[PDB]
Amino acid sequence: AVKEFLAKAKEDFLKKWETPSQNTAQLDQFDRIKTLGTGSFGRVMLVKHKESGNHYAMKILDKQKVVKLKQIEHTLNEKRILQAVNFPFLVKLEFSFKDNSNLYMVMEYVAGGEMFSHLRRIGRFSEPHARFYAAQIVLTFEYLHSLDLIYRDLKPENLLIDQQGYIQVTDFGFAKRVKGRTWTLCGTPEYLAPEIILSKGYNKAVDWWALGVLIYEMAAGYPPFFADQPIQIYEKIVSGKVRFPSHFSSDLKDLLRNLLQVDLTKRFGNLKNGVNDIKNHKWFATTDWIAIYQRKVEAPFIPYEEEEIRVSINEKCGKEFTEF
């Protein structure tokens, strides 16, 4: 039954992957409530749809800055994935459009900050708290991997916690649709699987390694492999030696020993049973997988001069962002 749900999800994904939706709204259909922040390429604004009355978070990307910062491919790739995926723990892109100056990605409004900030505010998570979050990543990676997507950017900064207390994964610039191997070095060093560092090619198994690092940091308060210089972090990653805190349970240490396996042919999530080797592990014995997917489990923790948008008369970077 799980196999046929993924089969229907992949068919739906391939339809939108083949024919991405474009220009599903325009700028004059939204009321500009307030600017929530100014970012790398542009600003993020809280907006209200004039007709429906719902609230959305509109990201405005200056097309010229995107070109200068060499982020053209990452921007188009994120938009193509977001308009085609559909899963409870992924940020939902509601509308997208462009004009002469900017790109516009109208997102669902999610207040509640990133996991990185909360992790530094609390310190560390209790094992039941971490398991709640880890279970969501497991289902998310099961979904993305079934679409042949390697997320390969798992880190606390890319995990928001919504008002319901659930995880939403946000940054999809690096995500690549791969069936065989790939080689591009990307992602934060602390979460890189050893096969990435060795530059011998890698597949979806690097995501399960990243989950291993993520569970460790949540339960310990600090990542398993860390040093002042990246080259030292690389050595510790390839060496594989991990030290667990005393408060780590026996089940947790066993799961991490199988997720943080240096040999990708022995790593949990990359065996014949696939993701089920993780779901059926003793550490997740109390985990109701269907309930987590349905967002029924109670969350362990729940979280002015406005400037105008100038739309130039000249079309900017029309060639680069044609597919947006």
Numbering used by the authors: 14 to 316, 330 to 350
Paper lines:
β-Adrenergic signaling activates cAMP-dependent PKA, which regulates the activity of L-type voltage-gated calcium channels such as CaV1.2. These share a common feature with two Arginine residues at specific positions that can anchor the peptide into the substrate binding cleft of PKA. We report crystal structures of the PKA catalytic subunit with and without a CaV1.2 and test the importance of several anchoring residues via mutagenesis.
Based on these criteria, our Apo structures (apoPKAc) depict an open state of the kinase, whereas the AMP-PNP and ternary complexes correspond to different intermediate states. Most notably the ApoPKAc2 molecule adopts a conformation distinct from the other two ApoPKAc molecules in the asymmetric unit. The main difference observed between these structures and ApoPKAc2 is the glycine-rich loop (residues 47–56). Nevertheless, the ApoPKAc2 molecule adopts a conformation that most closely resembles a substrate-bound state. This lends support to the conformational selection model as this conformation of PKAc appears to be thermodynamically stable and can be sampled both in the presence and absence of substrate.
